[PDB]
Ligand binder design. Structure first.
Ligand code: BCL
Ligand code: BCL
Ligand code: BCL
Ligand SMILES: C/C=C1/c2cc3[nH]c4c(c3C)C(=O)[C@H](C(=O)OC)c4c3nc(cc4[nH]c(cc(n2)[C@@H]1C)c(C(C)=O)c4C)[C@@H](C)[C@@H]3CCC(=O)OC/C=C(\C)CCC[C@H](C)CCC[C@H](C)CCCC(C)C
Ligand SMILES: C/C=C1/c2cc3[nH]c4c(c3C)C(=O)[C@H](C(=O)OC)c4c3nc(cc4[nH]c(cc(n2)[C@@H]1C)c(C(C)=O)c4C)[C@@H](C)[C@@H]3CCC(=O)OC/C=C(\C)CCC[C@H](C)CCC[C@H](C)CCCC(C)C
Ligand SMILES: CC(C)=CCC/C(C)=C/CC/C(C)=C/CC/C(C)=C/CC/C(C)=C/CC/C(C)=C/CC/C(C)=C/CC/C(C)=C/COP(=O)(O)OP(=O)(O)O
Ligand SMILES: CC(C)=CCC/C(C)=C/CC/C(C)=C/CC/C(C)=C/CC/C(C)=C/CC/C(C)=C/CC/C(C)=C/CC1=C(C)C(=O)c2ccccc2C1=O
Ligand code: HEC
Ligand code: HEC
Ligand code: HEC
Ligand SMILES: CC(C)=CCC/C(C)=C/C=C\C(C)=C\C=C\C(C)=C\C=C/C=C(C)/C=C/C=C(\C)CC/C=C(\C)CCCC(C)C
Ligand SMILES: CCCCCCCC/C=C\CCCCCCCCOC(=O)[C@H](O)CO
Lengths: 323, 243, 273, 332
């Protein structure tokens, strides 16, 4: 067995390396320290971290959003500390309950929610600049930034684009552990069962697909760690037996295979598509589909089942029934 | 009237469904599956135009490689059937066939970002050490699959780019040499390093390095492959059925 | 037929059972004893699906469904058309899965690599068994298992959740979902990183292992490492089902109320009630 | 934290839909024992004699009974409502025709309410019906009532904690939660849906595409309505000690026919019945009950599903006294 694939038997220590970026070298902060136990299942060095204007801006905008949320939560328990701590999961910051359309809602009924959302959006945008600019500073491709962009875009879809397209801030996601959860069901119910949204299915296949691919890829690299398969950049530019055996394991199993470079394209694509699929689904929801189940019924796709208990007429349709 | 309704019994969500499928299959079949063919092709016994990488330390490479030389395989076919397995004609560990196979990697030293040799023994990497609390294997006996002492650990080889030990170096008992072994083939105990991949005698033919204090990408391949070959070839029983 | 680097690896050996008998290739695919048994179970399973499906009211892929028995049949045999086909197909599914896994072990051995992938493949097989075998046994009827149909199996998942009022509050579910999310996120990060290093853009130099660790130290103040991200990835993915399994098997056998109410253990502690 | 096996499970939909009840035997046992306390019917009495409209001075509703029959009903009522206090809960001991005590006037109206339920709402109560006991369970104040704000504990025979008290504002979210099966849904489904007939429980479209004129901006219902409906349904579920699949195939909540069970239609009639009881019999009693019975907005206690059902899909597991007391309905 390869014990190294479980944990690092013998850890190494060294002078810490700093690779210069085109700018911002002076804005790296912190004294690096070494954790023995972390060192068994990752690199032992924690820190330093890069600051920079966009990272700072992210913390300022994001902390503001979080402060607005937490303060409104505390009010919901009338500023009792014990109850705040107890009831925390049930507390939340809600979008407008009344229909004011796209008018900016009153503070007590949606206005604080909208404000926290504005600051969260600024925080996300700021962090994206960081993720993008750091790559450019280090002469790296912007693969991570563009994947991140899609995730941000999905958040904007459920947060303000769908609300804007159907014209009501009431459709947005609340802030809160259970309350943002409650929205999932409310939204699915309203639009006719999200199991019947095809983009929900696409998103799920890709989400499950990322599970499959990282289990398979992670396991594969561990399995060829004996040949240094983890050194994947130089395995790309100079194929080693690690990735020859990896390719052949899969070729012999499923009849075809990837390369050490291309498997990362598959993973990146699958990841991306969870968010691209979700976004399109949300954008079609409410705008051009009001009931996904009935949309499937329209197109003849929905499964049907025999009666078990006897069919039940809608009593609201019966003669002389009350309203 | 309905939002999203079009001519016929047709609607917009319906149209986007076909577009979605088209995009996915185009990406998969016309791009991703072509990126999959940058190594191992053309087959022997649909392809993208070549990709060229500018290397970090001078020079370029274009993949897949065309090597100016190719190796002669000491293998015999077991039958005339197209899909029949091959069979080693000699010692498969030294001949490097099957799981003892290595790749024709560059005979260049893997480098650090600042251009120094990446994989080096601690006698060269004097600014590196083993973390407090972990076993220092130097001076410990190496015990092979047959329970015989094959040698004594003389050094560790560290990756200076990732701060990660990748090989032990041991004096081979009765053969006036040292051999490297990847740490994946070592079970590190307090008083010994256990190696079940090969028998004690088989340490004698581990591929040798050209220089004592550095190692090339091909040499790393050769060394790693040798022990892997042992998993199937160390003894006659290992090539046979488990049950 | 062979990849350019394939021939040297095409040796005999690494089998669990059979010996040389099944130790050969059919095109790119390795066979082995478990390749034979895999094809056997697959052929048998697909045949049963076809025979059962012809007896139904539709050939539409979305609408076809092969369902388990009524609850009242318990853990016994059921008539072929009233749940028996389901029972047989289930057996074939399990045989194919386990065969596939063991075949991968034989291929690992031949290649001189670790058995990480087949071990990983035991996870989704394990979860299937939790859904179709272990939970139904505990509840006392095969009829609690999910049906085999493209859209119908979604209706099962859906009703099952709502039987416990709000399944989102299921604590094993919360863990399962968290792992689904973090894994997909980590795959995007990792895939993106490796491509960003090998494809710097323009005509720039490919970067380094040092650059990898610098990027993530800069962005989040920590980089886990090249090998370690492959251990982490496998751990995160696996735990989608390893943790999920607890929430699935708890629902019914160990809990019959709605899931939100479960959290009363915390909410209803006397001292803050 | 958890409940031990084995579990009682039923099937309420086609095999392989996972529709059906999931019950804990110990819980069902406790409830069966509690409901078994229902006093048995009083023995039959003499059918011949003058009607009490002749014999007695101030009989308005039960005037056609014979004296024996009438006094039997008085005894039954006492058992069901005020067994510990006896006749004098409602009566001036020295003048039985006097309406001087508030319980008397309320009780007359409750006789009318009960007869109305068993006559006019058989689409819900069927031949099972209700007696005073169904709600009261042997006390003047029924154990499961609602005010125009959430209250805890759900059972008013239980002593409240400080935080459970309606005056303690920090406990509001929990009072809301425990009425919607512990969900964090921020809606009171009682006042929203059961106190009156103002709101529409249905929230899902019956068209595949969005209908023009109802689908944009201020034409739209707010999504809040979908949360509020879900809150009522969590409350309904808990009050009947069941789950959604007792009434719906979750495939399509909004569909009837093979997608709903017979129980769902009965429940529909139940919502209409509750609204009649509240609007026309219970709410107006605030004029007749003392200040000490009223809520903080001057409201009389009112009824929801739990009032009768008390955690079971059928009240008292379907126990009936209908044949034993024809004077409680159905009325010819
Ligand atoms: C408890 C949770 C549920 C469940 C809840 C859901 C939900 C929710 C959704 C799905 C969806 C899917 N599920 Mg499911 N699903 C469950 C168990 C299964 C099992 C099984 C053997 O147990 C299988 C084969 C499937 C298969 C499927 C696919 C039809 C679909 C996409 C998955 C995907 O891309 O994954 C990753 C794998 C890949 C990317 C590789 C490609 C795999 C291909 C697509 C599998 C095709 C199998 C097909 C049905 C043929 C069966 C074999 C025949 C005999 C030939 N599910 C369990 C019971 N499933 C999605 C959908 O769109 O439904 C129609 C979806 O939204
Ligand atoms: C009863 C409820 C419904 C339901 C309601 C919904 C609704 C509504 C939606 C989904 C969506 C999805 N559902 Mg669903 N879903 C149900 C059942 C399922 C089942 C199942 C087995 O039954 C599965 C596998 C899924 C799976 C999924 C996901 C794959 C999919 C995408 C969401 C996602 O990845 O977000 C996880 C990722 C994110 C949220 C991205 C976050 C990224 C950002 C950048 C991170 C920022 C962090 C930052 C630090 C935070 C700062 C905040 C501070 C305040 C400042 N659903 C049932 C039927 N589901 C989504 C979808 O695809 O719709 C088409 C969606 O909108
Ligand atoms: C109202 C409905 C419910 C709901 C009801 C359920 C129920 C019930 C269950 C889950 C479970 C899960 N839910 Mg859910 N879930 C809901 C909302 C969500 C949301 C969301 C965004 O709101 C998300 C992200 C999820 C996500 C998830 C998953 C993480 C989790 C595990 C799925 C699984 O077991 O697959 C299983 C997949 C398999 C078993 C696949 C097996 C594959 C085999 C080994 C290979 C097959 C080979 C194939 C046939 C080959 C074909 C040949 C071709 C050539 C390829 N759910 C809502 C609230 N969910 C499960 C869980 O773990 O609960 C804790 C579960 O039991
Ligand atoms: C956490 C663990 C994750 C994970 C991990 C891994 N996943 C692996 C490996 C690892 C490590 C591999 O080693 C192996 C592989 O080779 O990689 C390509 C594999 C594989 N993952 C597949 C599907 C897959 N993974 C899913 C989930 C996860 N994967 C989770 C997320 C899901 C979901 C989510 O639904 C699906 C659909 C196949 C492509 C492949 C098996 C092929 C097979 O075993 O051949 C043998 C079996 C057949 C060829 C078919 C048998 C026909 C039966 C008898 C008749 C059908 C009956 C059936 C029940 C009807 C259902 C229909 C209805 C639901 C509509
Ligand atoms: C399919 C696509 C997947 C995906 C992809 C990717 N995801 C990425 C990237 C990619 C590519 C990055 O490059 C970026 C990153 O850097 O990684 C290394 C990132 C990130 N994904 C995070 C969270 C996350 N991703 C989720 C989902 C998915 N991701 C989906 C599944 C979910 C879910 C599922 O809920 C969560 C919770 C953050 C950690 C990070 C952004 C930090 C930020 O933007 O900060 C903005 C906010 C702040 C900086 C506020 C700081 C708060 C402090 C405590 C202030 C003090 C508080 C005070 C007390 C107040 C009073
Ligand atoms: C050359 C070679 C060997 C190539 C191999 C390539 C290969 C196998 C690649 C595998 C990777 C691929 C292709 C992945 C794609 C699969 C993925 C990610 C997801 C599948 C998702 C999936 C099946 C979604 C369906 C969504 C659902 C549930 C829809 C239900 C309702 C529905 C279908 C309605 C139909 C709509 C109407 C408009 C059409 C009918 O008229
Ligand atoms: C004809 C006959 C009866 C023959 C008998 C012999 C026999 C047993 C034949 C098998 C026949 C059967 C049943 C074939 C079906 C095989 C299957 C299950 C095919 C499904 C293909 C699917 C859906 C795969 C899903 C995963 C997916 C999206 C993969 C694409 C990306 C790839 C190829 C990832 C694999 C891959 C990974 C994960 C690496 O880490 C890695 C590292 C270094 C080099 C290469 C690789 C590599 O190729
Ligand atoms: C309420 C909770 C009551 C209890 C307990 C008892 N009685 Fe009653 N009684 C009640 C009402 C509302 C009425 C009027 C109903 C009507 O039909 O109009 C009555 C009426 C009587 C009468 C008729 C007297 C008359 O008007 O002449 C009698 C004789 C009577 N009640 C007797 C009685 C006895 C003996 C009781 C206990 C042993 C008893 N009542 C309890 C309300 C309630
Ligand atoms: C629910 C479905 C009920 C049925 C059936 C009957 N009663 Fe009732 N009653 C009910 C409520 C919710 C209330 C208000 C709470 C309260 O106790 O005030 C009542 C009230 C009365 C009272 C007044 C009690 C008091 O506060 O002193 C009486 C005397 C009374 N109810 C009697 C009564 C009788 C005799 C019934 C049937 C013959 C009857 N009630 C039916 C709820 C319900
Ligand atoms: C009866 C025994 C029911 C149980 C248990 C649950 N529901 Fe229900 N639901 C029921 C009825 C009679 C109605 C219609 C009310 C009316 O005025 O006609 C409903 C309604 C819903 C809806 C809305 C349907 C619509 O068209 O908009 C939903 C979305 C719904 N119910 C969901 C639901 C859930 C999730 C349940 C358990 C958790 C649940 N219901 C229980 C009857 C009954
Ligand atoms: C101490 C540690 C380190 C940090 C603490 C974290 C903490 C306690 C946070 C607060 C409590 C918690 C956990 C809350 C959780 C909330 C969750 C999970 C919320 C989830 C989702 C919320 C979403 C998607 C909200 C989205 C909102 C938007 C997209 C808004 C967009 C708004 C605009 C575009 C405004 C423009 C219009 C203009 C006219 C005003
Ligand atoms: C993707 C999320 C991963 C989160 C890992 C966070 C670890 C926290 C580390 C912070 C490092 C800050 C520098 C340390 C020295 C302090 C001065």
């Amino acid at each position: 067995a390869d014990y190294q694939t479980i944990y690092t038997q013998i850890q190494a220590r060294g002078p810490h390396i700093t690779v210069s970026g085109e700018w911002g070298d002076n804005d790296r902060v912190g004294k690096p320290f070494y954790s023995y136990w972390l060192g068994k299942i990752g690199d032992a060095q924690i820190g330093p971290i890069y600051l920079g204007a966009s990272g700072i801006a992210a913390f300022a905008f994001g902390s503001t959003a979080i402060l607005i949320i937490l303060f409104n939560m505390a009010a919901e328990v009338h500023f009792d500390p014990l109850q705040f701590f107890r009831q925390f999961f049930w507390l939340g910051l809600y979008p407008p309950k009344a229909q004011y359309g796209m008018g900016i809602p009153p503070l007590h009924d949606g206005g604080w929610w909208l404000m926290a959302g504005l600051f969260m959006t600024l925080s996300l945008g700021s962090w994206w600049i960081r993720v993008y600019s750091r790559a450019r500073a280090l002469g790296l491709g912007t693969h991570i930034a563009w994947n991140f962009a899609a995730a941000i875009f999905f958040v904007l879809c459920i947060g303000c684009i769908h609300p804007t397209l159907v014209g009501s801030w009431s459709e947005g996601v609340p802030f809160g552990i259970w309350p943002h959860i409650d929205w999932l069901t409310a939204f699915s119910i309203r639009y006719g069962n999200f199991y019947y949204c095809p983009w929900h299915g696409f998103s799920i296949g890709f989400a499950y697909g990322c599970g499959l691919l990282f289990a398979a890829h992670g396991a594969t690299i561990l399995a060829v760690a004996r040949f240094g398969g983890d050194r994947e950049i130089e395995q790309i530019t100079d194929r080693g037996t690690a990735v020859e055996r990896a390719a052949l394991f899969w070729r012999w199993t499923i009849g075809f295979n990837a390369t050490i470079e291309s498997v990362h394209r598959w993973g990146w694509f699958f990841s991306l598509m969870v968010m691209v699929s979700a976004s399109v689904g949300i954008l079609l929801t409410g705008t051009f589909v009001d009931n996904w189940y009935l949309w499937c019924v329209k197109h003849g796709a929905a499964p049907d089942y025999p009666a078990y208990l006897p069919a039940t007429p809608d009593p609201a349709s019966l003669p002389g029934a009350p309203k | 009237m309905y939002h999203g309704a079009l001519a016929q019994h047709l609607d917009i969500a319906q149209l986007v469904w076909y577009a979605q499928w088209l995009v996915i299959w185009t990406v998969v079949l016309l791009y991703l599956r072509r990126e999959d063919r940058r190594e191992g092709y053309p087959l022997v016994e649909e392809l993208p135009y070549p990709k060229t990488f500018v290397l970090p330390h001078g020079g370029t490479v274009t993949v897949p490689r065309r090597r100016p030389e190719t190796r002669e395989l000491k293998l015999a076919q077991t039958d005339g059937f197209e899909g029949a397995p091959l069979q080693p004609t000699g010692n498969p560990l030294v001949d490097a066939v099957g799981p003892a196979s290595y790749a024709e990697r560059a005979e260049v030293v893997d480098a650090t970002v600042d251009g120094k040799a990446k994989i080096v023994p601690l006698r060269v990497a004097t600014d590196f050490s083993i973390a407090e609390g972990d076993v220092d294997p130097r001076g410990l006996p190496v015990v092979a699959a047959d329970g015989v002492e094959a040698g004594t650990v003389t050094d560790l080889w560290v990756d200076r780019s990732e701060h990660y030990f990748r090989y032990l170096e041991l004096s081979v008992a009765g053969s006036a040499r040292t051999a490297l072994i990847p740490l994946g083939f070592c079970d590190v105990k307090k008083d010994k390093i256990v190696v079940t991949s090969i028998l004690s005698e088989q340490f004698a033919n581990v591929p040798r390095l050209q220089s004592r204090d550095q190692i090339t990408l091909r040499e790393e391949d050769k060394v790693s492959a040798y022990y892997a070959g042992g998993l199937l070839y160390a003894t006659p029983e290992r090539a046979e059925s488990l049950l | 037929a062979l990849l350019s680097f394939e021939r040297k690896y095409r040796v005999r050996g690494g089998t669990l059972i059979g010996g040389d008998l099944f130790d050969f290739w059919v095109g790119p695919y390795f066979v082995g004893f478990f390749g034979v048994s895999a094809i056997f179970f697959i052929f048998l399973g697909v045949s049963l699906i076809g025979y059962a499906a012809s007896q139904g009211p539709t050939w539409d892929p979305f609408a076809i469904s092969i369902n388990p028995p009524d609850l009242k049949y318990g853990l016994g045999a059921a008539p072929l058309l009233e749940g028996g086909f389901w029972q047989a197909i289930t057996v074939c599914a399990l045989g194919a899965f386990i065969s596939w896994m063991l075949r991968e072990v034989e291929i690992s051995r031949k290649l001189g690599i670790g058995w990480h992938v087949p071990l990983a493949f035991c996870v989704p097989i394990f979860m299937f068994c939790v859904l179709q075998v272990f939970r139904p046994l505990l509840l006392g009827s095969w009829g609690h298992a999910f049906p085999y149909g493209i859209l119908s199996h979604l209706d099962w998942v859906n009703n099952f959740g709502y039987q416990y009022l709000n399944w989102h509050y299921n604590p094993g579910h919360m863990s399962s979902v968290s792992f689904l999310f973090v894994n997909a996120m980590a795959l995007g990060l990792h895939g993106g990183l490796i491509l960003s290093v090998a494809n710097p853009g323009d005509g720039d130099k490919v970067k380094t292992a040092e650059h990898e660790n610098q990027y993530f130290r800069d962005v989040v103040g920590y980089s886990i490492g090249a090998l370690s991200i492959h251990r982490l990835g496998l751990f995160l993915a696996s735990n989608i089902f390893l943790t999920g399994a607890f929430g699935t098997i708890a629902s019914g056998p160990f809990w019959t109320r709605g899931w939100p109410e479960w959290w009363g253990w915390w909410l209803d502690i006397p001292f803050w009630s | 934290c958890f409940e031990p096996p084995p579990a009682t499970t039923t099937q309420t939909g086609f095999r392989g839909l996972s529709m059906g009840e999931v019950l804990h035997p110990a819980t069902v046992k406790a409830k069966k024992e509690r409901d078994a306390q229902y006093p048995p019917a009083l023995a039959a009495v003499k059918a011949e004699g003058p009607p009490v409209s002749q014999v007695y001075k101030n009989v308005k509703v039960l005037g056609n009974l014979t004296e024996a029959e009438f006094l039997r009903t008085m005894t039954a009522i006492t058992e069901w409502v005020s067994p510990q206090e006896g006749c004098t809960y409602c009566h001036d001991e020295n003048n039985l025709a006097s309406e001087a005590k508030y319980p008397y006037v309320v009780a007359r109206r409750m006789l009318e309410m009960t007869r109305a339920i068993n006559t006019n709402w058989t689409q819900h109560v069927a031949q099972t019906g209700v007696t005073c006991y169904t709600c009261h369970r042997g006390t003047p104040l029924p154990p499961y009532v609602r005010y125009l704000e959430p209250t805890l504990p759900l059972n008013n025979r239980e002593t409240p904690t400080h935080v459970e008290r309606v005056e303690t504002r920090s406990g509001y979210v929990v009072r809301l939660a425990k009425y919607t099966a512990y969900s964090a849904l921020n809606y009171d489904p009682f006042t929203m849906f059961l106190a009156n007939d103002k709101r529409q429980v249905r929230v899902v479209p019956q068209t595949a595409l969005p209908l023009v004129g109802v689908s944009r901006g201020k034409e739209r219902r707010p999504l809040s309505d979908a949360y509020a409906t879900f809150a009522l349904m969590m409350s309904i579920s808990d009050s009947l000690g069941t789950n959604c699949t007792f009434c719906h195939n979750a495939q399509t909540f909004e569909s009837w026919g093979k997608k709903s069970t017979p129980q769902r239609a009965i429940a529909w009639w139940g919502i209409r019945m509750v609204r009649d009881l509240n609007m026309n019999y219970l709410a107006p009693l605030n004029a007749s009950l003392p200040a000490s019975r009223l809520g903080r907005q001057g409201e009389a206690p009112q009824a929801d599903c739990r009032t009768c059902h008390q955690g079971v899909t059928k009240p008292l597991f379907g126990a009936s006294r209908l044949k034993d007391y024809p004077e409680l309905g159905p009325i010819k």
